[model samples]
Target: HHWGYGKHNGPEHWHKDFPIAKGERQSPVDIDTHTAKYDPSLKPLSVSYDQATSLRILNDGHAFNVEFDDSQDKAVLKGGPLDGTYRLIQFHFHWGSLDGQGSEHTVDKKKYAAELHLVHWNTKYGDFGKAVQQPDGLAVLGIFLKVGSAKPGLQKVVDVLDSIKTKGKSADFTNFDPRGLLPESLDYWTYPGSLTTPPLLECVTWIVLKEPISVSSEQVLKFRKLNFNGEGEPEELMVDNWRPAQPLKNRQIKASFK
Candidate 1:
């Protein structure tokens, strides 16, 4: 059985197939802001995203992803907790059927309307697949989305949803910088954790932004319109595409700002 956001094969059942699902350092954990240690030494994140490297956007059954050409360091992330430069590989989102039901990571046990993951792989490894097996293989910047004023930057991604409404469908998405989607504050919480999806590789250094971005109710509704099925299959709306927060275990979450 494949992994999905259904009662039978969702996150609760992932452990049956992925043994690392119960690993010591898992991701999307409830972030206790008050408990996070403020480290003044943490450097501000330095990100450079070249729109030319943006290849296309696709719906890969699980989520809608905006893929990039990571063949070189055209777009990269450095500074902060990162030891070496990381190439921007792709970015995706997780959302729910309603405004209050999305986001994987929570603050004070409260979930936002949605979450965005800007995924990158360590340049030292030379490639994404090879990098995934190492402890410091990947870095993911997590941004929380709230229901408020419409974000013009998000509108660019939402505009292409119609072209890739179903799984396996994709559209040309070039010259669109991902930095525009981020909040002005680079302040974040850093931790070692696994990917929220299978095979649940514990290789990511998570950088969760402290500030939340605003998105209108109308734009939030567009995420629900995406279908998990292909053209000929029965249409099933791809809502609630998020994994619940895992146990924090023995790990300590560090904050970049006081």
Candidate 2:
């Protein structure tokens, strides 16, 4: 009775209670950069984030998480298409509904106005809840949020979103340096996906960023005034909260540059 995106429990009914939600490396796919594949040894993405290990900022009823402090390693994300490092621990977003399309990874297929999951894990599979269930254990870094300017380092995470507006709120977000909200060309697009939510663990490795940073339109209307109901129910309006791009079975996607 709890798995959402709404409209009778969204994401096409989460494969009726997470049967790997139609597994096969699932997760906001659809990057088609003319069928990706440009790899030239795909390395060059080393991030070190440490806005004092930014501590809190939650909402969780499906996105709004800023939580860091991964207990050391200050905030890392080594060599793209990784094989190591990967610590970060939190960062979330996937929006829509100020009028359609949100974003959960989509390129040649367009769709963008939000989608920024920084979530990392793999310190050789030791934490992040057992590296989110193995399989080369997690690496998500996707970033595509386009609206236009005003991204002064994401307005300190959009000013802590009204201090975690509803749905199990949270606060005390620290220094706030999630790499100053990237996009000065980290040219990317890797593959192997899963975890667009709910035990949908095929254990990520996605990457995705091909430049797209700005944000405004009143900061996406304050992330649609968060509230997937909680704190007494009957509110629900976290906006499109994206999820729709799946199937790319037997995957391939590469591309660090050309």
Candidate 3:
């Protein structure tokens, strides 16, 4: 019950229960671009998204997420390091309380304003539950966000935060296409890693974009207003919900673009 980004139940305490927190190939590792080997074999990742696939947006006490319809192949991720098509399930953000330090995966030990994770599951495993148990069952597309001019693409999500300000709240967030949020360049660094949260399974193939998308300082500030606490409970802001970068260990990180 005590899993959150607070001083007591944050990342540091996660290891106490989820021992894998210190396991091999943990996620959100620092991107040492200089050391990343160029893998010419890695193909440009393709995303086929349908605006109608969007279902709702919710603040699940950790981060606000937009879930999609995974019953069909309406939206999927393929190519890159993938062997088969992966279904789009949900997307969420990890942000800091302040603009200077929020992103989970740092660059040369540098922190960005925030980070976005588009979570997909391999259909071979049948369901998200079954897929999460396999090493190659999941794929997460990460995009770094920096505070700059207002990103027109982010406005849609920003406008809906107020409707679900507290944990366990949600709203109808249909007709939303996540493709709009991607950066101009899909050039990325792929690596074997785990989920950044609890039950931190190492099933994810992390494809982090090299280029960051811009968002107004105000847009990020709006997300901070989300509450980690539910209504009628003690209030807590839902910011700085990022996991610290873990050790890279023996894993090799490959870049699609040199």
Candidate 4:
């Protein structure tokens, strides 16, 4: 094949650098959120951290996808006594199904290299599964991914960049709680929204960090190391899995503590 590794080489050529998914979902559409309906029933769901375990990565031949299980660890947050602290459940990342641009939330009509989503629920009302389906039940933190060597808070994640280079490879990563990866500033952009993926739950409290975290070009490449299948089989490379921006229907995206 031609056009070896790196973003410039077309996705097909890039797939060869890693694996390709035959039936995998592709993402990143030109986000146009000028038509979303406004709803005021949304508010932040509280969440607290009991203990964050070491991050564990699985090489599904797609990318270095991490799974954060909160069945044991716990946290506490409150919402005017109505939204009480909810334990963290799990967290993951969103990437392009090749390269170029594959982030979920676009800003000023520009797409980032990637997006990270940390999912949580209000345990004060019910368990995670139940909360995921109900309106005002899920809280997801969205982090933007830019290419550079600015904020190295992500150095921990980028350090393990080569663990899952192939299909079915994994590594034990501790000293991280998904949240720690967030930008230091607590100020964020909040709004009522739905899950960016299938089933597209319309009930979600989206917290888009006002400031984005800076990840190096090398760190972004780790996202391309994913495969959706087992070893010894054709890989499902992930270069673009970002969804197009949705309509914001006169909805006001508020800033934290606003």
TM-score of 2: 0.34
**Candidate 1 lDDT, 1-258, residue by residue in tens:** 888988899999999999999999998999999999998888999988754378899999989999999888888899999999998889999999988889999999999999999999999998789999999999999999999999998899998899999999999998888877989888999999989999899999999999999999999999999998888999899999899999999999999988
Residue pairs clashing in model 2 are: none
Q: Write the per-residue lDDT of candidate 4 for residues 103-190, one digit (tens) a residue.
A: 8787668777788877667775567768866777777777887777745556677667566666567888766756557776644566
The true-structure Cα RMSD of candidate 1 reads 1.0
Two-way TM-score contest, 2 vs 4, winner? 4
**What tens-digit string does per-residue lDDT give for candidate 2 at 104-178?**
888988898888888888887678888888877889898988887788888877877887888788998877788
Q: Whole-model Cα lDDT per candidate?
A: 0.92, 0.85, 0.93, 0.59
Model 1 whole-model lDDT (C-alpha atoms): 0.92
List the candidate 3 regions with Cα displacement exceeding 4 Å: none
Model 4: ten consecutive residues of lowest lDDT: 20-29
- Report the C-alpha displacement of residue 53, candidate 3, in angstroms: 0.9
The better candidate by lDDT, 1 or 2, is 1
- Choose 1 or 3, whichever is better by lDDT: 3
For residues 1-258, write the lDDT of model 3, one tens digit per residue. 588888888899999999999999799899998999999999989888853389999999999999998998888999999999899999999999889999999999999999999999999999999999999999999999999989997899999999999988999998897878989888999999999998999999999999999999899999999999999998888889999989899999999997
